[PDB]
Amino acid sequence: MDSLEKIKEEVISCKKCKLWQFRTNAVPGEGYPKAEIMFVGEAPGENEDKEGRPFVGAAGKLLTQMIKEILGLERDQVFITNVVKCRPPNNRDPEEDEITACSPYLDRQIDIIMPKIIVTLGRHSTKYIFSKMGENFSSITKVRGKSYVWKYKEKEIIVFPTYHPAAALYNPNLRKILEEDFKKIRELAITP
Ligand code: SF4
């Protein structure tokens, strides 16, 4: 039967799409297998590629800070991953065939963890999860900051889209919006 360990093993030696040729390390994701909160980003950047870990760059450090200061959590209490797990060449967006190739890893991760809340960071991860939900996706600007109920298997999963933290690095107002979004996420997390 499946496990997060198996997914990690498959991912780190995975050659199922053309992104494999460009990487130093695949990025399978990390954190608590019974996390109530699961963060899903787009694809790895250059620091993530170098470390084999998600959200470790400047954007990741901001994420970490918000998780600590606003949610009140350490990273090892949540689960963090990406819809695509290898860094696209020249940091382009992933292509449909790449999202198609890689996303079953994410489906499998969701299947195992069954989080209370999935926080989708940015337009790509949000659009992917919306497609699995069967929810119409317009733009990240239009859907961010709202909770969506995803009936999945026996559970309701709350999906909460927001901006990617990299977008908040040099934009004070957008960072204030992300912070407010994380406040709503904490409220969702602590409410029965
Ligand atoms: S991006 Fe995903 S499917 Fe493509 S090689 Fe990396 S782990 Fe495999």
From Swiss-Prot:
Catalytic activity: Hydrolyzes single-stranded DNA or mismatched double-stranded DNA and polynucleotides, releasing free uracil
Enzyme kind, highest EC tier: hydrolase
SMART domains xrefs: UDG, UreE_C
Phenotype for residue 169 to A: No change in activity
Residues holding [4Fe-4S] cluster: 14, 17, 86, 102
A Pfam family hit: UDG
Effect of residue 170 to A: Lack of activity
Keyword terms: 4Fe-4S, DNA damage, DNA repair, Hydrolase, Iron, Iron-sulfur, Metal-binding
Keyword Electron transport: no
GO biological process: DNA repair
Residues the record lists as binding uracil: 41-43, 55, 82, 164
Alphabetized GO MF terms: 4 iron, 4 sulfur cluster binding; metal ion binding; uracil DNA N-glycosylase activity
PANTHER family: TYPE-4 URACIL-DNA GLYCOSYLASE, TYPE-5 URACIL-DNA GLYCOSYLASE
Function: Removes uracil bases that are present in DNA as a result of either deamination of cytosine or misincorporation of dUMP instead of dTMP.
Protein name: Type-4 uracil-DNA glycosylase
Organism (species): Sulfurisphaera tokodaii (strain DSM 16993 / JCM 10545 / NBRC 100140 / 7) (Sulfolobus tokodaii)
